[PDB]
Amino acid sequence: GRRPARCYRYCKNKPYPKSRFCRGVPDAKIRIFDLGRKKAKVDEFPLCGHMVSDEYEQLSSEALEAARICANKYMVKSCGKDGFHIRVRLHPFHVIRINKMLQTGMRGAFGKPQGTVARVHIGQVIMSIRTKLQNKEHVVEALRRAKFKFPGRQKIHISKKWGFTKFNADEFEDMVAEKRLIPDGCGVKYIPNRGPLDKWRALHS
Amino acid sequence: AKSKNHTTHNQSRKWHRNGIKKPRSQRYESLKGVDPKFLRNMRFAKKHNKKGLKKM
Amino acid sequence: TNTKGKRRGTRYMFSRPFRKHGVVPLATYMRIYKKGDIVDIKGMGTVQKGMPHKCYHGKTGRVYNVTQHAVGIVVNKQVKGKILAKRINVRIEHIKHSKSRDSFLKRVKENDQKKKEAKEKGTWVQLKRQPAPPREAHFVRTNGKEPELLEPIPYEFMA
Amino acid sequence: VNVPKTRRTFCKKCGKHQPHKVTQYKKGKDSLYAQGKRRYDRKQSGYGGQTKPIFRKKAKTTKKIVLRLECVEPNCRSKRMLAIKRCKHFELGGDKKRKGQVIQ
RNA sequence: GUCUACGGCCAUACCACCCUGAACGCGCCCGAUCUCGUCUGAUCUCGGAAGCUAAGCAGGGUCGGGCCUGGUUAGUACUUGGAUGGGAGACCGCCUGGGAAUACCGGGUGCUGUAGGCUU
RNA sequence: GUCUCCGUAGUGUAGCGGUUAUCACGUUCGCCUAACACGCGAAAGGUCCUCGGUUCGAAACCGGGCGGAAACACCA
RNA sequence: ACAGUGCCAGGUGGGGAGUUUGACUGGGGCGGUACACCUGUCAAACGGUAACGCAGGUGUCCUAAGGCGAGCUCAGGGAGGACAGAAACCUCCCGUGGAGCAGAAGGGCAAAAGCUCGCUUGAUCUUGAUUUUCAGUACGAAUACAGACCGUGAAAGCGGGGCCUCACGAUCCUUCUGACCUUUUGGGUUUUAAGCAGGAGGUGUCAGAAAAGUUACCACAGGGAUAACUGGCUUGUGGCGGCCAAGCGUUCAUAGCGACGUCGCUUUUUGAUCCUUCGAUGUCGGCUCUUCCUAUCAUUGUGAAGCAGAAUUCACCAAGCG
RNA sequence: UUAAUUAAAACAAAGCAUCGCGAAGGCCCGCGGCGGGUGUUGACGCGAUGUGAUUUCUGCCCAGUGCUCUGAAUGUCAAAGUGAAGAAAUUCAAUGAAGCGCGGGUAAACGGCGGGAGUAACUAUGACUCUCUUAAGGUAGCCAAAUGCCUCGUCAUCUAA
RNA sequence: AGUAGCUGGUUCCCUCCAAAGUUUCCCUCAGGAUAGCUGGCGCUCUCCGCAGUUUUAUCCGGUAAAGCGAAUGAUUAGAGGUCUUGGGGCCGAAACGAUCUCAACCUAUUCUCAAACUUUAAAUGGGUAAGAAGCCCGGCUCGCUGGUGUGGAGCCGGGCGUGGAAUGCGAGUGCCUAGUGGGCCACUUUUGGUAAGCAGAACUGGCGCUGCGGGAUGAACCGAACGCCGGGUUAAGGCGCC
Ligand SMILES: [Mg+2]
Ligand SMILES: [Mg+2]
Ligand SMILES: [Mg+2]
Ligand SMILES: [Mg+2]
Ligand SMILES: [Mg+2]
Ligand SMILES: [Mg+2]
Ligand SMILES: [Mg+2]
Ligand SMILES: [Mg+2]
Ligand SMILES: [Mg+2]
Ligand SMILES: [Mg+2]
Ligand SMILES: [Mg+2]
Ligand SMILES: [Mg+2]
Ligand SMILES: [Mg+2]
Ligand SMILES: [Mg+2]
Ligand SMILES: [Mg+2]
Ligand SMILES: [Mg+2]
Ligand SMILES: [Mg+2]
Ligand SMILES: [Mg+2]
Ligand SMILES: [Mg+2]
Ligand SMILES: [Mg+2]
Ligand SMILES: [Mg+2]
Ligand SMILES: [Mg+2]
Ligand SMILES: [Mg+2]
Ligand SMILES: [Mg+2]
Ligand SMILES: [Mg+2]
Ligand SMILES: [Mg+2]
Ligand SMILES: [Mg+2]
Ligand SMILES: [Mg+2]
Ligand SMILES: [Mg+2]
Ligand SMILES: [Mg+2]
Ligand SMILES: [Mg+2]
Ligand SMILES: [Mg+2]
Ligand SMILES: [Mg+2]
Ligand SMILES: [Mg+2]
Ligand SMILES: [Mg+2]
Ligand SMILES: [Mg+2]
Ligand SMILES: [Mg+2]
Ligand SMILES: [Mg+2]
Ligand SMILES: [Mg+2]
Ligand SMILES: [Mg+2]
Ligand SMILES: [Mg+2]
Ligand SMILES: [Mg+2]
Ligand SMILES: [Mg+2]
Ligand SMILES: [Mg+2]
Ligand SMILES: [Mg+2]
Ligand SMILES: [Mg+2]
Ligand SMILES: [Mg+2]
Ligand SMILES: [Zn+2]
């Protein structure tokens, strides 16, 4: 049906989003980017491991969907359906075209949309998994398997941030004690020393 | 048969063989294009310059 | 190919800057332009009259004519291997006095005054500019402190 | 396109603005003794067939409307041609537009 | 210290709320004969001077939003010129110069021209 | 594939920018006949294929979708 | 007094004559118009910049939708008010424009460029200069002025079309307008005719021939600038092969298979392109004959099976011989 | 019958059927005429076509395109001629030959000869019904035929295949 | 001796200079006209002017990057309010009474994006200026503008040379003019295409027109460009033997 992914591995064309100038793009293969216990509070899952791209390339929505299933199944098998929270961090927005042959030749050769791909950079995170700390080895194995669904080189890297937050894990707890961080579900809100003093009263009352 | 369409390749090489000379500058410039009303008077100012020759 | 339209490609060139739309400040019309002035042309989209053609945006010329609303400018335009002196008519909204000659005019006056002040004193002063010379020898005091030793930091995969 | 049947414009004879009667201009019939029609008849006479081009590839679907102004001053009665842009429908002294009305 | 008329730059001047306003002002305010205009003297126009800073307006406030300006981001991203540099590539490193922008942190919150007032 | 064209009650079909969306058949009710049929008097029933746009107003006009029917595909 | 003939006039007249039967173009034809224009992008922060590149528009519309002045402020929303509801009209409040400005888009615009009134014809007459495409030619469109006549406003001013970027047309001919105009041939008068200036009638292949086919009966000058074989690059498609392992295999991922994904190889498929060959490389298939490859069907020697035997299946060295 | 790549199913043929013409004619030649051929002819003839022995048959369509027939009843219609205005050139009007338009005939003239839906008591069919539709809507025959893409149609026979 | 925008050919030597395959118009696409590129003839001066360069000032810009807790557009996930609307229920005599619950809604957050988005915003780049045609004085003319002998322009006399950044270099100017108007390749940027020794662009440099050392071999790669020679030394590349 679709061409081998080697035909579209390289970011050769400018980004080609689904817009009012590109109509008729088929729906993407990946429609779910979060699964696991999305509703876990920020503190239940202090660990976060990433799959990081070593290559500047295009990933197809089929490979994102395949990896999501691959990583999720191994996590459910080893940590339970409520022991983790996965977040695919790439959305397939760039559209790839196909000039379908069977004849005009190369005349009028601009192609119709064929699918979608995500344009990833060196160092960009492909997907992330947060779970409890005694699942460090399970996270590494879950992401190591998912790599086989992608072209090119990736690295699994355990983050020093707390879960899916932007704050270093070693200093997360104290910031929560000083009310600089207020849990808001999956993440945290950051409280600066600014704005109406009334807010400070509510936090400190 | 099809052929090439357009190119400026090799053009700046041709332009610089005899140099891209700037326009020639003289200390007096033509009064062509200046306002007719202003120029009508300027002619009248030159016409009667001889009147005040003796005072000068 | 491209259209030969007059205002093609000026989507950003002729638009007004951010949060600077609306009324045109009246000091734009209180400027006095004289024959022989140097002016910078900058098309303004708010006024659609007397708009200089896009090829003249960002070029500087000499004022040769002044009318009720616009001036005549002699501005060089390069077309292939030649440079032409083009006489355009531009409404005074789209121009502004050039500051290029000021640093020269400021220098002309200070030179003539120095040339006159030093003359009566029977001395000699520098009038010509000069490119920055290589910095002369100097001592650097350590102030009884040892320069901080620096080392390259280890690579750490901040992903 | 609707134009009034009168307008106050410049008359060249009177050298001042004057009322004018506005009418549409019509080409008059071709004289048989215009030098070019005389030359055409002599060239078309005899053998050889057609001797001039006959235009076929018509492309324009409208004409420029020419208004035949006429000074109303009894003494002057000077006339002028005045061309407006192309239009598919042209009327003189049509009903003037009304605003804020129910369209039946 | 500060206001009025006309301004220049056009948020450091805006927006929200709160406090305070001496004198002169500027207003709110009271009327419709006249001028003028309305369904309506509400607005516009006109004639006034009983009352009031309630509001506008002015000054001040807010761990205020915005705006302005610095720091950090960062010699990072990007980039001019160079190599018979690496790599299957994708790309990457170095040499020679230039060098950003968020989030985050701090500070500031109209200046001023002409003419005329008030303010021992 | 290019190009042309078409979707309107249950069926086949009209609609000359403002229709109570036309016609026939069909369905429903009442008459007639012992009864049916014909025949006479009445009635209901349109997602105007779908989205969006111009318009005072669109089933119509204008683009994009969902189906459908045509004519072309030659020189080797 | 007609047949008839001579000469004119109208019809008919592929029986016959001459001639034409666009261009671009991933060969040509079919298809499209990238042929004259305009917007955004491409386009690599001056300008310029190509493809049958991408997304669109144009051949019109307007007596006001032109000009001036005044007064107002829009989309949307919140809260209220008989009939009144999601939606009628009235009121208050917020409202940077999220509306509108003929149309495509982009820019521009808030006591306005928008909406509503009032008065109007600067959409008039006229000589030059300039800008844009550019060869610094024409057209078209546009920009500052200058001379008149007007409109409007209290006035400063604004206006010689549409807020800006598009909305269009030479020579020859014809037609209309202008002057107490020139000429109309030996002189004069008068008709006519020709001139001079300015509009219009149109060339859309849009710097502007007047134009249908077929050729397999065909012709000539050429072209490898250009198609139909081979060969060459490419490998989408075709063919063949790995990697991961959800599952299948009663159990058991991998004896044998293998989804979702992904990495290759090859040129025994078809494409794409047009580099060689058009002063010619004989164009399918079969017959014959030799050789070569392995991606192994058989046979030799082996490993593994969900290999008891027999039969079969997977794999290895392997193209000697069939 | 294509001399010198095609001998044939192609041409011819008898048979059949249309068409023009009674001589000042039909058809044709010729620059030209009291010119010429048919024609030393006369409708059982000459001239122009199509089909192609015999046998059986030759359906429907005159809307299209052709051919043909009637014509001042009557739109357009050249030259000439008639009249009026004017100094005249010129202008205008009236009048109106064929031919076109108007109306008939004609297909052994060129040619043409539909679509959709429902329906019989198992299912399939659908004699039957409704509808839209054109100038007729392909009749009698015949067929994967030298004519049928799909297609190496389906059944049977012929073969071991 | 028909015409041929088409094919083929076009005859001695040396010396000097030396292209174009691009712009616009053309029933123009195998061809012309046109500008550009070339050559020739000079001439006007010189022993101030100029520049494919920097420096110093001064403007222009909307690409790279970045942003989306900023406008437009696209897009993931939780959280807090919620009656201002709906879906499920659920006690009911039943109501906006109660009870929840999931949606939408709003509020701060959060993941991910743009050739036809943007508040920001480079590098490289594009104008201009860097004096005697300047600077400063006194006066005269005007029909232009005007409260003003104002304003602006022009003209006349006069005084000022430390020639007002670096570097390099002699400049200017006029006629006549051929061939060309099929290009192709490489770094970088870049459009279409799966890609192509594919089609199409920008910049510069090349091949074409060009030999020579090296890359065994080769239009373009690397080095370096050429009168006929001797000596020396190199480049890129090399030094088992060839
Ligand atoms: Mg591409
Ligand atoms: Mg060319
Ligand atoms: Mg004749
Ligand atoms: Mg007081
Ligand atoms: Mg009152
Ligand atoms: Mg108070
Ligand atoms: Mg603050
Ligand atoms: Mg202040
Ligand atoms: Mg004929
Ligand atoms: Mg002929
Ligand atoms: Mg052609
Ligand atoms: Mg550029
Ligand atoms: Mg107004
Ligand atoms: Mg004027
Ligand atoms: Mg207007
Ligand atoms: Mg005489
Ligand atoms: Mg043929
Ligand atoms: Mg034939
Ligand atoms: Mg081939
Ligand atoms: Mg394959
Ligand atoms: Mg199983
Ligand atoms: Mg070739
Ligand atoms: Mg050969
Ligand atoms: Mg041979
Ligand atoms: Mg041979
Ligand atoms: Mg083997
Ligand atoms: Mg023969
Ligand atoms: Mg017949
Ligand atoms: Mg008939
Ligand atoms: Mg036929
Ligand atoms: Mg038939
Ligand atoms: Mg039958
Ligand atoms: Mg000859
Ligand atoms: Mg030719
Ligand atoms: Mg032509
Ligand atoms: Mg040739
Ligand atoms: Mg741009
Ligand atoms: Mg970017
Ligand atoms: Mg050539
Ligand atoms: Mg190329
Ligand atoms: Mg090529
Ligand atoms: Mg050559
Ligand atoms: Mg050379
Ligand atoms: Mg060389
Ligand atoms: Mg080699
Ligand atoms: Mg030597
Ligand atoms: Mg060697
Ligand atoms: Zn008059």
Swiss-Prot record, chain A:
Citrulline: residues bearing it: R31
Keyword Ribosomal protein included in the entry's annotation: yes
Record-annotated disulphide pairs: none
One Pfam family in the UniProt entry: Ribosomal_L16
Superkingdom, taxonomy of origin: Eukaryota
Cross-link entry Glycyl lysine isopeptide (Lys-Gly) (interchain with G-Cter in ubiquitin), positions: K179
Organism: Oryctolagus cuniculus (Rabbit)
Family: Belongs to the universal ribosomal protein uL16 family.
Name of the protein described by the UniProt record: Large ribosomal subunit protein uL16
Alphabetical UniProt keywords: Citrullination, Cytoplasm, Developmental protein, Isopeptide bond, Ribonucleoprotein, Ribosomal protein, Ubl conjugation
Record-level GO BP terms: regulation of translation; translation
Designated gene of the protein: RPL10
Main location: cytoplasm
Keyword Ribosomal protein attached: yes
Quaternary data: Component of the large ribosomal subunit. Mature ribosomes consist of a small (40S) and a large (60S) subunit. The 40S subunit contains about 33 different proteins and 1 molecule of RNA (18S). The 60S subunit contains about 49 different proteins and 3 molecules of RNA (28S, 5.8S and 5S).
Function as written in the Swiss-Prot or TrEMBL entry: Component of the large ribosomal subunit. Plays a role in the formation of actively translating ribosomes. May play a role in the embryonic brain development.
Post-translational modification note: Citrullinated by PADI4.
Cross-link position per record: Glycyl lysine isopeptide (Lys-Gly) (interchain with G-Cter in SUMO2): K166
Record-level Gene Ontology MF annotations: structural constituent of ribosome
Locations listed in the record: Cytoplasm
GO CC annotation: cytosolic large ribosomal subunit
From Swiss-Prot, chain B:
Protein name per UniProt: Large ribosomal subunit protein eL29
Family: Belongs to the eukaryotic ribosomal protein eL29 family.
Annotated localization: Cytoplasm
Function text: Component of the large ribosomal subunit. The ribosome is a large ribonucleoprotein complex responsible for the synthesis of proteins in the cell.
Residue span of region Disordered: 1-32
Assembly behavior: Component of the large ribosomal subunit.
TM spans (from-to): none
Residues recorded with modification Phosphoserine: S30
Taxonomic placement: Eukaryota, Metazoa, Chordata, Craniata, Vertebrata
Part of the whole protein covered: 2 to 57 of 245
N6-methyllysine: modified positions: K4
Basic residues bias (residue ranges): 1-25
Residues bearing the modification N6-acetyllysine: K32
Curated annotation (Swiss-Prot), chain C:
GO biological process annotation, one example: translation
Region of interest (Disordered), ranges: 111-144
GO CC entries: cytosol; endoplasmic reticulum; ribonucleoprotein complex; ribosome
Compositionally biased spans, kind Basic and acidic residues: 111-122, 135-144
PROSITE patterns per record: RIBOSOMAL_L21E
Keywords from the UniProt entry: Cytoplasm, Endoplasmic reticulum, Ribonucleoprotein, Ribosomal protein
Gene3D superfamilies associated with the record: 6.10.250.3260, Ribosomal protein L21 (2.30.30.70)
UniProt cross-references to Pfam families, sorted A to Z: Ribosomal_L21e
Single GO MF descriptor: structural constituent of ribosome
InterPro entries in the record: Ribosomal_eL21, Ribosomal_eL21_CS, Ribosomal_eL21_sf, Translation_prot_SH3-like_sf
Record localization: Cytoplasm, Cytosol; Cytoplasm; Endoplasmic reticulum
Subunit structure: Component of the large ribosomal subunit.
Purpose of the protein: Component of the large ribosomal subunit. The ribosome is a large ribonucleoprotein complex responsible for the synthesis of proteins in the cell.
Annotated family: Belongs to the eukaryotic ribosomal protein eL21 family.
The protein's name in its UniProt record: Large ribosomal subunit protein eL21
Species of the source: Oryctolagus cuniculus
Lineage of producing organism: Eukaryota, Metazoa, Chordata, Craniata, Vertebrata
Curated annotation (Swiss-Prot), chain D:
GO terms for biological process, alphabetical: translation
Keywords: Cytoplasm, Ribonucleoprotein, Ribosomal protein, Zinc
Localization per record: Cytoplasm
Signal peptide: none
Gene3D superfamilies noted in UniProt: 3.10.450.80
InterPro entries: Ribosomal_eL44, Ribosomal_LSU_eL42, Ribosomal_zn-bd
Positions with a binding annotation for Zn(2+): C11, C14, C71, C76
Record-level Gene Ontology MF annotations: structural constituent of ribosome
GO CC term, one of those recorded: cytosol
Quaternary structure annotation from Swiss-Prot or TrEMBL: Component of the large ribosomal subunit.
Role summary: Component of the large ribosomal subunit. The ribosome is a large ribonucleoprotein complex responsible for the synthesis of proteins in the cell.
Family: Belongs to the eukaryotic ribosomal protein eL42 family.
Official protein name in the record: Large ribosomal subunit protein eL42
Species this protein is from: Oryctolagus cuniculus
